[PDB]
Amino acid sequence: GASIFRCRQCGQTISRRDWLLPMGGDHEHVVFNPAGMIFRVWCFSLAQGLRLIGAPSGEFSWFKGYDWTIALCGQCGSHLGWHYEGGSQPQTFFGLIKDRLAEGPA
Ligand SMILES: [Zn+2]
Numbered sequence: 001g002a003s004i005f006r007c008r009q010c011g012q013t014i015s016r017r018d019w020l021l022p023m024g025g026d027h028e029h030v031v032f033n034p035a036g037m038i039f040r041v042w043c044f045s046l047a048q049g050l051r052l053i054g055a056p057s058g059e060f061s062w063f064k065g066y067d068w069t070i071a072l073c074g075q076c077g078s079h080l081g082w083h084y085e086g087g088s089q090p091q092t093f094f095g096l097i098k099d100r101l102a103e104g105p106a
Contacts (some may be wrong), residue, residue, distance in 0.1 A: 001104070001105050002104060003017050003104075004103070004104060004105070005102065006103075007071065007074050007102070008099070008100050010073060011101070012022065012074060013044065015048070015105070016046075018071055021032050023043040028040065028043075028098070031043075034060055040097065040098045044093065047071070049074050051077075052069045053069060053070040053072060054070065057069075059081035062095070063084055066086055067085055068085075069083045071096070079100070080101060
């Protein structure tokens with residue numbers, strides 16, 4: 001009933017509840033960017049159906065040791081979160097914005 005996450009804007013398949021990743025002890029992290037926008041980020045070890053934009057950047061990174069790339073919905077272009085890489089245990093993961101996903105049956 002609530003096992004997969006889809007893009008809220010279009011329905012694209014994005015991730016699964018089974019793939020939630022407790023980073024630093026919680027899968028949920030609330031953060032702001034330099035423009036003051038607050039994001040409720042859920043960390044996932046894996047995601048699909050995204051389009052990762054550009055090359056990674058360490059600037060303003062919310063997770064120590066990781067560089068990020070913007071992750072858009074590959075279907076509709078909605079900003080769904082970020083892909084993190086260049087770090088350690090794990091090397092990579094996804095930080096997705098909770099309220100931009102819809103949860104539902106597989
Ligand atoms: Zn979408």
